[PDB]
Amino acid sequence: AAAA
Amino acid sequence: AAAAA
Amino acid sequence: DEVLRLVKDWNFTWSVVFLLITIVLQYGYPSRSMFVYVIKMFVLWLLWPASMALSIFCAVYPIDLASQIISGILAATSCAMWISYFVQSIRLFMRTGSWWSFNPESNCLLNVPIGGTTVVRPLVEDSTSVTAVVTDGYLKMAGMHFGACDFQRLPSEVTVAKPNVLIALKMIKRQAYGTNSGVAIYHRYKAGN
Amino acid sequence: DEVLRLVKDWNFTWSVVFLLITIVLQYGYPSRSMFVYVIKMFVLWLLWPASMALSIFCAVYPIDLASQIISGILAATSCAMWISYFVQSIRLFMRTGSWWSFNPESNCLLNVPIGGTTVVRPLVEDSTSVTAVVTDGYLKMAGMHFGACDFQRLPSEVTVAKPNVLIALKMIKRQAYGTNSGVAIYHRYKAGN
């Protein structure tokens, strides 16, 4: 969902 | 003559 | 005889530790290598309780009254720093969900929603405005490469999260250079809790 | 009797050193405070020769052959790292003249000539293009605030300096939103020596  | 900020 | 043996043991171990500290201090940054960065992180996690436990030992076996008081203050110093790190890191992680929130280097994060996913990047300098540029379908925001995004599908809002506050910035100006090229500016309008 | 005294003295000094290392490792970055940054630099300058001297001592007084060989390799490692730092720092200083060239965190520098002076800022990510935006007479380049500059007096060229090569980027796109507001894009065209 959250990529960094 | 050069400003490092 | 036995006197010299321990000297060798202590000096050997300390020499290895000193080299490790030199390496993480010289190369331990994400802009250099993530590998040495993770090593530096492991060192810091180990370093907090070691400093506190060491100062507690010196407080129990002091040289004099002044050493006792300084040892107590230094031990409380280690504790306060660990507590502070945990508080701000957890707050930023609850706000963003990114692992970048555990990086002592950055206390500002920029969240950009690309399509149905969110990409987070640490922000170098806090500001009230953020500039986005798309060239031939590739998007770069605030001078940082963010990835592949069509100029027509740019998000209306973008968020900046700090340990204490979350800020929302809405699009204001939109200029289309080409079919899939253009420039946009986001300005802040509201503060969060 | 004297046995316990040395324990007390050594443990006290080590406790102070451990606390100092925790502080520079946690807060020693320009994005947090310049004060701990200078302390961290002082620690690193001192750390190179101490590590080398420690390993040389263990090579003279080793536990066995393996300790001696490892001590030699670690000593050469300390020496090589110091030489590498000095070479890369001096090269960037000859190219830019900025003290930012002595920061192991950043090996890319952006030089912008505002009027008759030059302002240098470390660059987070290398790129072939640089975006500049001026709002009401204040200039911000690559998402970094650079200062006060009139939109009409924007530089034609801007330079990016690495330890080995210097790159020049000239203005391509120029759009004026207001009297002293606009956006410009600089792209690279030449490589240096």
Ligand SMILES: CCCCCCCCOCCOCCOCCOCCOCCO
């Ligand atoms: C582009 C070059 C990058 C590589 C640079 C390093 C190349 C190898 O360096 C060679 C220097 O090695 C010196 C090691 O010295 C250790 C001394 O060993 C002492 C052991 O003596 C035992 C006596 O019984």
Ligand SMILES: CCCCCCCCOCCOCCOCCOCCOCCO
């Ligand atoms: C940009 C990379 C440049 C790399 C340059 C490498 C230079 C490193 O040189 C290291 C020299 O090592 C010599 C130190 O080792 C000698 C050991 O001390 C002598 C004692 O020998 C053992 C006594 O029993």
